[PDB]
């Protein structure tokens, strides 16, 4: 309801001991939690603010040069020093220039030359950091209410704000009981090494070491009156026309080269207080304090009618919107699925408790039929109109799509994606541990390899694997190669 057809929405039917299921909800898309005798909760991550940033170090892109000075010595006198060289605002460089009687020096030869320049960068970009004690993770959850203004709505839900200060919080649904979120924001996407890179009006996320190795002059970031720039020489060049003399020239702005310099970086909107998106956090759902709208209602005894047609959702599910013209009291919507030439019950109600509210609200039911031809009867009585939908595809197609989704989810979250359904523990934990053990070394190995180069090294390792007379070497190389190709086809998402 909060989300249909987003593309990554994926069901989780988990009923563990004490009824807690662990879902790691990523920022890109929601999750849907169908449960037995529980209201099917729909959860999507909302804006993840992080305010009160600390500047750390800033670095400039455009520079300006003023106050040129220059002295020179006769060839054998040695170096030349200007009295203003010790100033941190001056850029200096030594070069050898040929001097002679035309230059007012008695001894012919090559003497040293030096130049200076005051330096005050313009439009400095600043890279701030976010400490953990100011995060503003929030989660909005919705219930599958029978309601006409709920099909794909984005501004209806219950807001659950979960800072690392309040690690676990519960959100009270208005009449469905309450949910207990046992989250763990501290283990989410790393926010002690990332550095926000707000420049002009756009922000960015970058690695700590990478930001400390950007080849531009930096400042301290101590919000001082005037900065003291380290490594100024790298922004300004000193053309030495022949060997007669040299002058200084700045390299203009850099914002284009900067924007090019970070492509793999994720972007983040920054207006006033930063409102960065795209982060992911895992959470645990305490669903043991829920109620299902009204379970004491009676079942309907009148007719139904379709106001609007049915339609798929690229996940094998239907959205049926039904208006109840019967004047009688709010009643639970009867439902049954009629298979082809059979009375069998296949398929289930994603809404899980469709109930009319006011006899005028076209409350909508959402369900999935079997992959064959299906008949969805929607009411009691012989005069109960039958919605017929033919859902194309087979079960094995669903299996392959699930395999693709699982692999793609693992390609991003690494080991954290290993736990996404039931808590398990008997066997899930061991798989998580072994995959983490291998993957930490793996991602510590290929860190910094491009698209095409990762593909190429993977195929090279595979080719090596198909040309060795060893089971161990062959299997290891071919597995690593195929995994590398698959990761490269998904990397740089």
């Amino acid at each position: 309801m909060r989300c249909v057809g987003v593309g990554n929405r994926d069901f989780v039917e988990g009923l563990s001991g004490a009824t807690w299921v662990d879902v790691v909800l990523e920022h890109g898309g929601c999750v849907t939690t169908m449960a037995k005798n529980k209201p099917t909760l729909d959860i999507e991550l909302q804006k993840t603010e992080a305010t009160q940033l600390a500047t750390l170090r800033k670095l400039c892109i455009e520079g300006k040069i003023t106050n040129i000075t220059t002295d020179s010595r006769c060839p054998t006198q040695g170096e030349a020093v200007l009295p203003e060289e010790q100033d941190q605002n001056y850029v200096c460089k030594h070069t050898y220039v040929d001097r002679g009687w035309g230059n007012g020096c008695g001894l012919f030869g090559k003497g040293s030359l030096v130049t200076c320049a005051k330096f005050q960068c313009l439009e400095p970009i600043e890279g701030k950091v976010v400490q953990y004690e100011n995060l503003k993770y929030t989660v909005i959850i919705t219930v599958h209410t029978g309601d006409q203004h709920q099909v794909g709505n984005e501004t209806q839900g219950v807001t659950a704000e979960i800072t690392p200060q309040a690690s676990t919080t519960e959100a009270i649904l208005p009449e469905y009981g309450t949910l207990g979120l046992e989250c763990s924001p501290r283990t989410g996407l790393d926010f002690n090494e990332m550095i926000l890179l707000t420049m002009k009006n756009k922000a960015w996320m970058v690695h700590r070491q990478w930001f400390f190795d950007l080849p531009l002059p930096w400042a301290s970031g101590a919000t001082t009156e005037t900065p003291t720039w380290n490594r100024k020489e790298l922004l300004v060049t000193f053309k030495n026309a022949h060997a007669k003399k040299q002058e200084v020239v700045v390299l203009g702005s850099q914002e284009g080269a900067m924007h090019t310099a970070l492509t793999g970086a994720t972007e983040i909107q920054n207006s006033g207080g930063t409102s960065i998106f795209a982060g992911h956090l895992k959470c645990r759902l305490k669903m043991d304090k829920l109620e299902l709208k009204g379970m004491s209602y009676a079942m309907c005894t009148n007719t139904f009618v379709l106001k609007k047609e049915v339609s798929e959702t690229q996940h094998g599910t239907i959205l049926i919107k039904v208006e109840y013209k019967g004047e009688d009291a709010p009643c639970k919507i009867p439902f049954s699925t009629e298979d082809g030439q059979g009375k069998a019950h296949n398929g289930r109600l994603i809404t899980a408790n469709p109930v009319v509210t006011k006899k005028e609200e076209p409350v909508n039911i959402e369900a999935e039929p079997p992959f064959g031809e299906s008949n969805i009867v929607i009411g009691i009585g012989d005069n109960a109109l039958k919605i017929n939908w033919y859902k194309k595809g087979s079960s094995i197609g669903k299996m392959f799509e699930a395999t693709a989704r699982g692999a793609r989810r693992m390609a991003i979250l690494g080991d954290t994606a290993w736990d996404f359904g039931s808590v398990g523990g008997v066997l899930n934990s061991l798989g998580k541990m072994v995959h983490q053990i291998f993957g930490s070394a793996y991602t510590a190995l290929f860190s910094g390899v491009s698209w095409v180069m990762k593909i190429g090294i993977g195929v090279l390792l595979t080719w090596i694997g198909l040309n060795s007379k060893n089971t161990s070497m062959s299997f290891s190389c071919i597995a690593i190669g195929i995994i590398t190709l698959y990761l490269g086809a998904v990397v740089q998402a």
């Binding site: 990554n8 990523e26 920022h27 890109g28 898309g29 996407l189 790393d190 090494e193 990332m194 960015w204 996320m205 970058v206 690695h207 990478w210 190795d213 950007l214 080849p215 531009l216 790298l234 850099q254 080269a257 900067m258 924007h259 090019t260 310099a261 970070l262 492509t263 793999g264 970086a265 994720t266 972007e267 998106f277 795209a278 982060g279 992911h280 793609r408 991003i412 991602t443 290929f446 860190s447 910094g448 390899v449 491009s450 698209w451 095409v452 090279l460 080719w463 040309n467 740089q492 998402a493």
Partner: protein, 75 residues
């Protein structure tokens, strides 16, 4: 100068599409290809180097292709 060593390969990302995905992804190989098209002689040079070293065929291919990938990128 900052355009070299673009932020890529560092593991900090998710399924949200990043900055300049398609353009940045194909930029490097397009530049290599256009540099190769500018100067075909180095193809002859790399073929000679690959032919006279390697003492195999797969090795010949590896040095040839990788060497041809180097120079436009080290340029």
């Amino acid at each position: 100068s900052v355009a070299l060593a673009p932020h890529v390969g560092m593991g900090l990302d998710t399924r949200t599409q990043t900055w300049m995905s398609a353009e940045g992804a194909w930029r490097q190989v397009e530049k290599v290809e256009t540099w190769a098209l500018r100067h075909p002689g180095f193809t002859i040079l790399a073929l000679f180097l690959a032919h006279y070293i390697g003492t195999s065929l797969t090795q010949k291919v590896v040095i040839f292709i990788l060497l041809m990938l180097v120079t436009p990128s080290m340029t």
